Amino acid sequence: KLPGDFGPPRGEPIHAVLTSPPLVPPPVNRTYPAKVIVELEVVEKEMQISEGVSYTFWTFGGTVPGSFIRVRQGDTVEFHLKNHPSSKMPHNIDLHGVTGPGGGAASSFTAPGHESQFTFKALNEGIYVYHCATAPVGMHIANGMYGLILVEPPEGLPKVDHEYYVMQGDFYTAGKYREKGLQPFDMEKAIDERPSYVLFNGAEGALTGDKALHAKVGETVRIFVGNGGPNLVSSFHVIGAIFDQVRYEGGTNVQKNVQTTLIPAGGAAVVKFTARVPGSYVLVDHSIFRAFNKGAMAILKIDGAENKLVYSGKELDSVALGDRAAPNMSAVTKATQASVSGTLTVQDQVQAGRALFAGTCSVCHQGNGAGLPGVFPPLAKSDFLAADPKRAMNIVLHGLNGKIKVNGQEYDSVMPPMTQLNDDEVANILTYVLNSWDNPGGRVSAEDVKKVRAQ
Amino acid sequence: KLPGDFGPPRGEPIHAVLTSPPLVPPPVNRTYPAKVIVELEVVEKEMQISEGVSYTFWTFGGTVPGSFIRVRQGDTVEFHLKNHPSSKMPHNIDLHGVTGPGGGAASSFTAPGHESQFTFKALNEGIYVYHCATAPVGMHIANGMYGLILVEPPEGLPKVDHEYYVMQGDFYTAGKYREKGLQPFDMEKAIDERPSYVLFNGAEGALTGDKALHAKVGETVRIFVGNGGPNLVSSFHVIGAIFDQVRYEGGTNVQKNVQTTLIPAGGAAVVKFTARVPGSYVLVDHSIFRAFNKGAMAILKIDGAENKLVYSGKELDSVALGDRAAPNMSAVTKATQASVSGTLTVQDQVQAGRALFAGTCSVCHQGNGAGLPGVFPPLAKSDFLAADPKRAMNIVLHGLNGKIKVNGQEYDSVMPPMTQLNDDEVANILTYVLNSWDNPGGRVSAEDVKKVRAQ
Amino acid sequence: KLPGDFGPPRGEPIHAVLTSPPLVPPPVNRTYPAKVIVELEVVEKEMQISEGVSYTFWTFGGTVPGSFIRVRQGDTVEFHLKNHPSSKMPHNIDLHGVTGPGGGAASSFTAPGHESQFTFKALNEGIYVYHCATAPVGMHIANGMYGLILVEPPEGLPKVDHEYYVMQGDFYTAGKYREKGLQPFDMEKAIDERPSYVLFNGAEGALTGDKALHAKVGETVRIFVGNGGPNLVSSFHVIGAIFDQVRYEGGTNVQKNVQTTLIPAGGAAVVKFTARVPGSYVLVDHSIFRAFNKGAMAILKIDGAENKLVYSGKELDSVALGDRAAPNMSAVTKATQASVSGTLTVQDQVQAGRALFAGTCSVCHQGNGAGLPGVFPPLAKSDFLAADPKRAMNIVLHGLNGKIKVNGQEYDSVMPPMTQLNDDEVANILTYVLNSWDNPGGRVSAEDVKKVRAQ
Ligand code: HEC
Ligand code: HEC
Ligand code: HEC
Ligand SMILES: [Cu+2]
Ligand SMILES: [Cu+2]
Ligand SMILES: [Cu+2]
Ligand SMILES: [Cu+2]
Ligand SMILES: [Cu+2]
Ligand SMILES: [Cu+2]
């Protein structure tokens, strides 16, 4: 026998129902091998990789990651790849778990407006990455051409309350993190393995705030976790919880009771979580600058009764989650669009700066700008801020130390530089502060900050 | 007892037969512990790390990786290290799996023209990296000073049809990838972990094309897989197949049925593959820019009958394998040598450009230059190419977009920039295109391209 | 049941005794669940990250890594975090192994001079990283805010002879490796994952020479191994030995008989070592430029009888361990302090250069400067050195090749450049050589070298 030796296909041909992230198709719930027809279409399109930041993604099914495919070990899969006629590039597919050269690549080569097909038997149970394998392969994967296929064991997976679909990728923009506008792919950064963004499901905030995954206290969650790369290895981790089980691809080995697990580039794992106490559980790449400086954070939000005997503490806030504690940062998108249109108002800037102030400034100056007398000076009704708004731009870009006097009190501390903030971000944060807490109002422009940065 | 407590050496002293990659010594096939005498000589020498690219390697036994050593758990090993008198540097050896300080390092210190010896008992079964441990250690490992020793279990490994020897390394050249000439080691890139090449067995194409590993449908293959580093961790992966078994060093744990496995820097694994359908199975570091932009791809070629019930698709071609689909790129070596000699002919350039055109240009313009009317413009009998050969140099270096007219048809698409191509590569590709498909002939020089790149 | 369902706390409340690295609290040795009160204080302070190199660390309990916490699965932990009033920054804590949002983060937010508390039940047995989770999280972790908590299984761990505490971190200084002075945190290098130092226990040499860990032949050692990151994954390895067992966090899976093991960023493992033969066993990150160029090396020194049947070789020396073979490099600290004070003597420079010469120069020129006639020229009574001390500065910075004559003998070899040596290091090494072996004496200044480097 080969593995997956369950006989020829029986029953009727099945048209696979594919799902967009973060959702998963229902279990196949089948005791016989089937001919499964899969139809997947490549679409090239602009999407928001961050608020006010567009990127030309190349997608399987219009999403990053691509549509989720779910079949049964021993199935015969008739794979149809279409390339939308709006595409500029040819594309193909390499599915992990396929037995045969290129995992489908040579037979699935598809020009814009064409369709290709190949047939394979799913011999190998497991969770598997699929991706484009068109020269230059790294460019296609970097632009978002990856997803997951699940080959179920014949008896199916154990029932759980929720199944979700989460995939990490590293992304390479010409511009710096959160630099606004349409950002080209940067080949130099990709070859050097120096990503500008590291993301779950193709965007900053794709799985935070009002887009969090949900479950209730007492329920079981299974997450199909992919690492599309192209280049990075994920120190994949859940903050404040533990995985009951971690199983890689279709491996025989199952690790139980771990919190931190390494997912290779092109790798995939099935993780199981039991909800015990309510709150936000953060999925991160624990290579920490990825999670906290490049976007690599997703949320599983658990609702239900607190258990003070297990955990007496509060729900996560802007101290740890920064500007992603809030439901969304839609005001940044709106302020960026208004800048492009030449219609940016003070209130556009105030609402964008309000979103960006959380964590970034609030951890020390507080959400109300009061600070802590003698320790963190106030931004609320600040005489020092009002006396010199241009000095305030320098303070954000280049930091501040030494003795100062604010509202009649001496400070002798250190505010670190925040030079990685973009000109629009500094301008919008300071406009928010000037228009809050009885401050004098007016505005700071991106152009004002550009000139102070240039020194 | 210590582990490997099999008594004193018996029988006759055995002179170990060492093998060069990718071959392995035969199984020891022995029921008693032996005194094994190992003789390994360090040689410093220039070799081709890529076509027309030389590098001064430092080698154990004249190869990268070094000669394969095969002994039995419980053996007494008398290790002789010689340093060839042509060497400039002192060398030594640290074998993983040795019980004792430095794994041999202090007692194996060997100046040019000298010999050292130390004795160790092989207590620990497993596959193990050995490497040089001479200050500065990273420089010696970076220049190729690593290989594998297998310590067999007393009963031997299970029989297989083929055993092969494959070792990844990261390499640091002063010049960029495929920049021609003798390339010095670059300490700055090595300290930053920014390799110019990531290779299997010490060269681009060492295990591709006419140097592929072979087996037949139905046969079992065991690969001894090393990661010499110095710095990178391999997302080690087989395209289009699965590993029956993966076992790290002499670990008790064996993973079964996985496709993608992380091999630490200085780590080693034994993988087992069963051949099911014919074609090329690609071994890669799935940190994808390594595999597709820095050389990290090897081939296991399976011959035998197709099974359309398991896989209906075609053998891999230049779409996925690029310029390594072909048997070899010997024309690039020959054109580089002719440039050095000042004897470079048009035909030298044409044959080199023919090799480099595969994948790099052919994925969109086709192997015959016809393109796809209205989608990818033709290079065959191209009026647009002929009208301005200098514009063609700019197009390759800097890309092209917007409306153009080629052979009476409008195109409105995007050709990405290919600025990572070296001046000789652009010149040779364009000379190939000009001398093919009824194009006007003539030639483009490396110097022509240097001037266009300088703008 | 939840896991760790051992009933309510019994007995008396226990004030946890915490230990500084590399020591561990004694086993809890308890058959009942307890209320454990933990008190940990954040201190910001300058410490030596290398000889003559200061850094402002942020610490849990005044050390990097932070104080070790030891409790029993099923314990109720009342966690008190104090922030010393000298602190400039707010801090908090996220303990892996805590069941609840942020692992403690929202409830442990603590301004300078304040205290916070939260209670959690230790449901999950294992070894776990804890760290600060205050925006910007990567900055706090990069400055040293991490350590380990052990949650014992109810029956306790198996008895061993020694338990030690070793934690890797990556560090980001504005200055280059071993550049002297107070070094600021460098956000740009941290975001790029380009550390200047990779260290065990917060400093170069923290666990080498006279600070090595100890045990005797025949004894068992358990090491609690953390990777605080923030960014790097450790190819964690013991030179010249094997781990009996490696267990990650509280995972069910235990790997036995491995030498090289990958520890994720934010991960932790318990390793077990049996001492077989005497000597220094080096713990490294086998991403080799970290271990040999950035400080990532620690020593377990085994005393006892040699066993020539297992290993005939010598103890490690400066060939493999370089300048860390010696007990300490205190002369470098003293010479750096004397430079700051403007009191640097020739003898200050000689003793610092003596420390730095080991490995760096001695591997080729020998510890006595004799070299090897015709192969490595002498530094002892060197006519070539004496004839031009300025040429000697160029040779160290930029290397030397080609035919030379030294003390009546021709050399035709290659000395690699050592441009990564700092101006003070070149000046002190050459002053050592000039004042040794009947050389003419005098001195080379850091300023002399600065001018030669500037060309
Ligand atoms: C702690 C880590 C802080 C963060 C984050 C931010 N700021 Fe700050 N800021 C902080 C200190 C300790 C000080 C005083 C420094 C000293 O020399 O003692 C400051 C100072 C300012 C000021 C000027 C003083 C005042 O008006 O109160 C301004 C205008 C200011 N900070 C603004 C500001 C903004 C907008 C922030 C986010 C972008 C921000 N700060 C972050 C401590 C900390
Ligand atoms: C697809 C990803 C392509 C690859 C790889 C290469 N080329 Fe290309 N090329 C492509 C397009 C879509 C276009 C037209 C762009 C537009 O504005 O619509 C081009 C154009 C050229 C041209 C000029 C037009 C012509 O003569 O047909 C030349 C001379 C050319 N391309 C050459 C070329 C070479 C030599 C390549 C490898 C080095 C190469 N191209 C790659 C699409 C793609
Ligand atoms: C081997 C890897 C070496 C290391 C490490 C260092 N040196 Fe060296 N040095 C070496 C060689 C082979 C040569 C001769 C090169 C040639 O062209 O043949 C040298 C030369 C020098 C010299 C000049 C000659 C002499 O006086 O003997 C000096 C002053 C010198 N080397 C000093 C030196 C110092 C101070 C080192 C550590 C910083 C050092 N060398 C390292 C080989 C090697
Ligand atoms: Cu594609
Ligand atoms: Cu793949
Ligand atoms: Cu060597
Ligand atoms: Cu090693
Ligand atoms: Cu902190
Ligand atoms: Cu953490």
Nearest-angstrom CA–CA distance, A52 and A156 = 43
- Numbered residues of the known binding site of C for Cu(2+): 91, 94, 96, 131-132, 140, 145, 286
CA angle, corner B389, sides to B387 and B391, nearest 5?
Answer: 90
Which atom belonging to ligand 1 lies closest to the Cα atom of A375? 12
Q: In what order do the strands lie in the sheet with B197-200?
A: B197-200, B162-171, B220-227, B268-274, B243-248, B255-258
Contact A262 C266 (CB under 8 A): no
Angle between helices B389-398 and B423-434 in degrees, nearest 10: 130
**DSSP helix, strand, coil percent of chain B (3-state; round to 5):** 20, 35, 45
Q: Is B170 helix (H, G, I), strand (E, B) or coil?
A: strand
> What are the strands, taking DSSP E only, across C16-161?
35-50, 53-60, 69-72, 76-83, 94-95, 115-121, 126-131, 146-152
Q: Which two tokens stand for residue A391?
A: 């000095």
Nearest-angstrom CA–CA distance, A234 and A297 = 12
Resolution (angstroms) stands at 1.6
Contact B363 A134 (CB under 8 A): yes
Distance in Å, CA B91 to ligand 3 centroid: 16
Task: Specify burial of residue C83 (Cβ count, 10 A radius: 0-12, 13-18, 19+).
Answer: buried
Partners of residue C232 in chain A, C-beta under 8 Å? 287
Q: Which two tokens stand for residue A335?
A: 């302020």
- In the numeric block, the tokens 């400093």 are attached to C203
Nearest-angstrom CA–CA distance, A338 and A84 = 32
CA angle, corner C113, sides to C107 and C114, nearest 5?
Answer: 25
Residue-level length of chain B:
455
Phi-psi region of B4 (alpha: psi -120 to 50; beta: other; left: phi over 0): left
Q: Which residue of C has its CA nearest to A365?
A: C90
C251 touches chain B (CB under 8 A): no
CB burial readout B40-50, b (16+ within 10 A) else e? bbbbbeebbbb
Q: Which of A262, A320, A376 sits opposite C133 (nearest CB)?
A: A320
Q: Which two tokens stand for residue A433?
A: 């502060």
Nearest to C246 by CA among C234, C262, C232: C262
* B90, B134 Cβ separation under 8 angstroms: yes
Residue C176 CA to its chain's centroid (Å)? 17
Contacts 24+ apart (CB under 8 A), B27-30: B27/B70, B27/B152, B27/B156, B27/B157, B28/B70, B28/B71, B28/B72, B28/B152, B28/B156, B29/B156, B30/B72
Partners of residue C264 in chain A, C-beta under 8 Å? 235, 237, 260-262, 286
Please state the φ and ψ torsions of residue C334, each to the nearest 5 degrees.
-65, -45
Integer-rounded Cα Rg, in Å, for chain C is 25
Residues, Cβ < 5 Å to ion ligand 5: A 266
Nearest-angstrom CA–CA distance, B273 and B237 = 12
B242 touches chain A (CB under 8 A): yes
Nearest to B453 by CA among B116, B229, B386, B444: B444
Q: Which residue of A has its CA nearest to C120?
A: A311
Which atom belonging to ligand 2 lies closest to the Cα atom of B430? 35
Nearest to C437 by CA among C363, C328, C362: C362
Strand pairing class (B297-303; B243-248) = unpaired
DSSP H or E segment with residue B224: strand B220-227
Contact B292 A138 (CB under 8 A): yes
A361 marked as binding residue: yes
Contact A250 B240 (CB under 8 A): no
Mutate which of A293, A364, A406, A438 to test ligand 1's pocket (most atoms within 8 Å of Cβ)? A364
Give the C-alpha distances (Å, rounded to integers) separating B32 from A370, B8, B128, C192: 80, 9, 22, 54
Nearest-angstrom CA–CA distance, B66 and B59 = 6
Q: In what order do the strands lie in the sheet with A94-95?
A: A69-72, A146-152, A126-131, A94-95
Q: Kindly report the nearest CA distance between residue C98 and chain A, in angstroms.
A: 6
Which residues lie closer than 8 Å to C274 by C-beta, 6 or more apart? C218, C219, C220, C221, C244
Q: Identify whether B22 is preceded by a cis peptide bond (ω within 30 of 0).
A: yes
Q: Which ranges in B46-158 belong to alpha helices (H)?
A: 137-142
Distance in Å, CA A143 to ligand 4 centroid: 8
C86 touches chain B (CB under 8 A): no
The C-alpha torsion from A371 through A373 and A375 to A377, rounded to 10°, is 50
Nearest to A389 by CA among A438, A446, A335, A440: A440
DSSP H or E segment with residue B199: strand B197-200
A80 marked as binding residue: no
Question: Is C376 near ligand 3, meaning CB less than 6 Å away?
Answer: yes
Which residues lie closer than 8 Å to B129 by C-beta, 6 or more apart? B96, B146, B147, B148, B226, B227, B228, B266, B267, B268, C260
A145 marked as binding residue: yes
Structure determination method? X-ray
> Which residues 417-436 of B are in CB contact (within 8 Å) with A?
417, 419-420
Nearest-angstrom CA–CA distance, C84 and C66 = 15
Mutate which of C292, C293, C364, C419 to test ligand 3's pocket (most atoms within 8 Å of Cβ)? C364
Q: Which residue of A has its CA nearest to C139?
A: A289
Partners of residue A322 in chain C, C-beta under 8 Å? 135-136
- At C227, the amino acid letter reads N
Q: Which of A259, A262, A288 sits opposite C249 (nearest CB)?
A: A259
Strand partners, C58: C44
Phi-psi region of A205 (alpha: psi -120 to 50; beta: other; left: phi over 0): left
Nearest to C136 by CA among C191, C178, C174, C183: C191
> Which residues 294-323 of B are in CB contact (within 8 Å) with A?
294, 308-320, 322
Nearest CA to ligand 1 atom 7: A415
Nearest to C149 by CA among C45, C229, C73: C73
Nearest-angstrom CA–CA distance, A94 and A106 = 9
Nearest CA to ligand 3 atom 37: C361
Q: Is A289 helix (H, G, I), strand (E, B) or coil?
A: helix
Contact C191 A237 (CB under 8 A): no
CB burial readout C393-407, b (16+ within 10 A) else e? bbbbbeebeeeeebe
Q: Is B321 helix (H, G, I), strand (E, B) or coil?
A: helix
- At B239, the amino acid letter reads I
Distance in Å, CA A269 to ligand 9 centroid: 20
Please state the φ and ψ torsions of residue A215, each to the nearest 5 degrees.
-160, 180
- At C20, the amino acid letter reads S
- At B354, the amino acid letter reads R
> What are the strands, taking DSSP E only, across B14-144?
14-15, 35-50, 53-60, 69-72, 76-83, 94-95, 115-121, 126-131
Give the C-alpha distances (Å, rounded to integers) separating B132 from A373, B137, B146, B248, C357: 60, 7, 7, 21, 21
DSSP H or E segment with residue A425: helix A423-434
Q: Which two tokens stand for residue C207?
A: 């666990």
Residue-level length of chain A:
455
Please name the chains neighbouring A, where neighbouring means 3+ C-beta pairs under 8 angstroms.
Answer: B, C
Other CB atoms within 10 A of residue C455 CB: 7
Nearest-angstrom CA–CA distance, A391 and A404 = 13
Question: Is A360 near ligand 1, meaning CB less than 6 Å away?
Answer: yes
Q: Which two tokens stand for residue A308?
A: 């003070």
Which residues lie closer than 8 Å to C441 by C-beta, 6 or more apart? C346, C434, C435
Question: Is A361 near ligand 1, meaning CB less than 6 Å away?
Answer: yes
Partners of residue A312 in chain C, C-beta under 8 Å? 107, 118-120
- In the numeric block, the tokens 């006097």 are attached to A405
Q: Which residue of C has its CA nearest to B85?
A: C375
Task: Specify burial of residue A46 (Cβ count, 10 A radius: 0-12, 13-18, 19+).
Answer: exposed
Residue B81 CA to its chain's centroid (Å)? 26
Q: Which of C277, C364, C375 sits opposite B100 (nearest CB)?
A: C277
Other CB atoms within 10 A of residue A15 CB: 10
Nearest-angstrom CA–CA distance, C414 and A21 = 58
CB burial readout A277-293, b (16+ within 10 A) else e? bbbbbbbbbbbbbbbbb
Domains of chain B (ranges; CATH) run: 1-156 (2.60.40.420), 157-329 (2.60.40.420), 330-455 (1.10.760.10)
Q: Which two tokens stand for residue C95?
A: 């303990």
Q: What is the DSSP letter of C173?
A: B
DSSP H or E segment with residue A451: helix A446-454
Residue C387 CA to its chain's centroid (Å)? 41
